[PDB]
Amino acid sequence: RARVVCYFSNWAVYRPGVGRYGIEDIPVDMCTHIIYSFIGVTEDTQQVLIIDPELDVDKNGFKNFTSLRSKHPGVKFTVAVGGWAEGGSKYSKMVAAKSTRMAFVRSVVDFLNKYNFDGLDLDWEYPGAADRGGSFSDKDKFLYLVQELRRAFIREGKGWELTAAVPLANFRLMEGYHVPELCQELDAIHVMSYDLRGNWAGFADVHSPLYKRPHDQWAYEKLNVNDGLQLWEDKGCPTNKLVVGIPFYGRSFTLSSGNNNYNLGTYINKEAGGGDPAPYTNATGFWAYYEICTEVDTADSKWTKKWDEHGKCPYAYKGTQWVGYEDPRSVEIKMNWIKEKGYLGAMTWAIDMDDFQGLCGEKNILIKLLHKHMSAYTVPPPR
Ligand SMILES: *[C@@H]1O[C@H](CO)[C@@H](O)[C@H](O)[C@H]1NC(C)=O
Ligand SMILES: *[C@@H]1O[C@H](CO)[C@@H](O)[C@H](O)[C@H]1NC(C)=O
Structure with a gap:
């Protein structure tokens, strides 16, 4: 019910x-x-x-x-x-x-x-x-x-x-x-x-x-x-x-220039407006689940995937790009x-x-x- x-x-x-x-x-x-x-x-x-x-x-x-x-x-x-x-x-x-x-x-x-x-x-x-x-x-x-x-x-x-x-x-x-x-x-x-x-x-x-x-x-x-x-x-x-x-989507960010700390709470380049737009949703700061898995989960992906142990959510990053989902x-x-x-x-x-x-x-x-x-x-x- x-x-x-x-x-x-x-x-x-x-x-x-x-x-x-x-x-x-x-x-x-x-x-x-x-x-x-x-x-x-x-x-x-x-x-x-x-x-x-x-x-x-x-x-x-x-x-x-x-x-x-x-x-x-x-x-x-x-x-x-x-x-x-x-x-x-x-x-x-x-x-x-x-x-x-x-x-x-x-x-x-x-x-x-x-x-x-x-x-x-x-x-x-x-x-x-x-x-x-x-x-x-x-x-x-x-x-x-x-x-x-x-x-x-x-x-x-x-x-x-x-x-x-x-x-x-x-x-x-x-x-x-x-x-x-x-x-x-x-x-x-x-x-x-x-x-x-x-x-x-x-x-x-x-x-x-x-x-x-x-x-x-x-x-x-x-x-x-x-x-x-x-x-x-x-x-x-x-x-x-x-x-x-x-x-069924992620919120993404562009990390601040020269920022190598990818932990939760890390500083961002807020003026960027979010992570760069993905190919299908074409929206800064917003990626569909299928946009995320096709990038993060492939065998030769260069994304690094981590886990928020308290929030119980994945996040992944590559370069200046970071997404939580x-x-x-x-x-x-x-x-x-x-x-x-x-x-x-x-x-x-x-x-x-x-x-x-x-x-x-x-x-x-x-x-x-x-x-x-x-x-x-x-x-x-x-x-
Ligand atoms: C509604 O269904 C008809 C018949 O299958 C189809 O031609 C049409 O494109 C559909 N419209 C939408 C908005 O899905
Ligand atoms: C993506 O949306 C932007 C507005 O942010 C628009 O200017 C651009 O034409 C769009 N590109 C495509 C391919 O839809």
């Missing part, structure tokens, strides 16, 4: 060569809930914004995705609104008044009906975040949006789910999230237990450490997956609503820990970055680990 929640990126179809990943590449039976990412909100009218209408509507992307249920009927297919590229300001604007929230809610209900989705995942990054166009009143008004969406979903009578992707840093929680009230209205809380470190922090480190390391101090002291999920529990979310995110060892350790803690299940950002071509020898290796572990696991009653 555990969940395996798979985010699917609608832009991965534009990656070149073996990076191209479309609806037809989703390994549907490895997931229990699959989430088409992203739609947005319009700035002026507070309606659903279709972000790639040529793909999502003209080439039938949304409907090909939802019509996957014909052959896979036990899986739920929902849509996510928001995401990082959307920004936060349009969402703060949309929730600022009852009238604008109701315009959005109506728009969402029409959309979910039009494309036969099973519900909505909220991915506003983030209510209350000054760095993302937010402000103080977002905390109350996001809860109002959630309560209003749930009521609309009940009125529609189709049993749609409402879920949200959430951060784990305490300051983000305090600024944006009425935890007990939200966890009561939502079917699942998809915890973004990743991007916990990265170029923005000014030092090299793995980005999904499971436990605290000695170098973790002040706002990093509890910024790890174990303590972050414990914070969600402490603030009032039931264990059986929490789904733990697992990144998840591999099968670390993902196994996290699946066992989810079961130990009794959480609702596992989530992946994102299924389009697993080694779905088997470039490294084993097709869909990471999602197969999530599926193997979760499908044999019974979620216990709340703690």
Whole structure:
């Protein structure tokens, strides 16, 4: 009764060569809930914004995705609104008044009906975040949006789910999230237990450490997956609503000039913006799992791979380049820990970055680990 929640990126179809990943590449039976990412909100009218209408509507992307249920009927297919590229300001604007929230809610209900989705995942990054166009009143008004969406979903009578992707840093929680009230209205809380470190922090480190390391101090002291999920529990979310995110990508860095120390916490060249872009994702500071394994795991690789003994995550480096990520060892350790803690299940950002071509020898290796572990696991009653 555990969940395996798979985010699917609608832009991965534009990656070149073996990076191209479309609806037809989703390994549907490895997931229990699959989430088409992203739609947005319009700035002026507070309606659903279709972000790639040529793909999502003209080439039938949304409907090909939802019509996957014909052959896979036990899986739920929902849509996510928001995401990082959307920004936060349009969402703060949309929730600022009852009238604008109701315009959005109506728009969402029409959309979910039009494309036969099973519900909505909220991915506003983030209510209350000054760095993302937010402000103080977002905390109350996001809860109002959630309560209003749930009521609309009940009125529609189709049993749609409402879920949200959430951060784990305490300051983000305090600024944006009425935890007990939200966890009561939502079917699942998809915890973004990743991007916990990265170029923005000014030092090299793995980005999904499971436990605290000695170098973790002040706002990093509890910024790890174990303590972050414990914070969600402490603030009032039931264990059986929490789904733990697992990144199928690495955060990379360019090390500072003449720096020969490759340990966790080593200084970086922050102005570089991260490690150099990889060939398929073409994004500074961000490498898909398949981009990492094809470089690090080959027999004649010149990368050096190490292990964070406390964070339980791999990292690898070569030259000035350093990347922290998840591999099968670390993902196994996290699946066992989810079961130990009794959480609702596992989530992946994102299924389009697993080694779905088997470039490294084993097709869909990471999602197969999530599926193997979760499908044999019974979620216990709340703690
Ligand atoms: C949807 O499926 C049709 C029929 O197979 C295909 O031609 C089309 O390219 C698909 N569109 C997307 C976005 O996957
Ligand atoms: C990679 O993205 C950069 C922006 O960072 C863009 O300028 C460049 O054209 C892209 N290259 C490819 C091959 O997509």
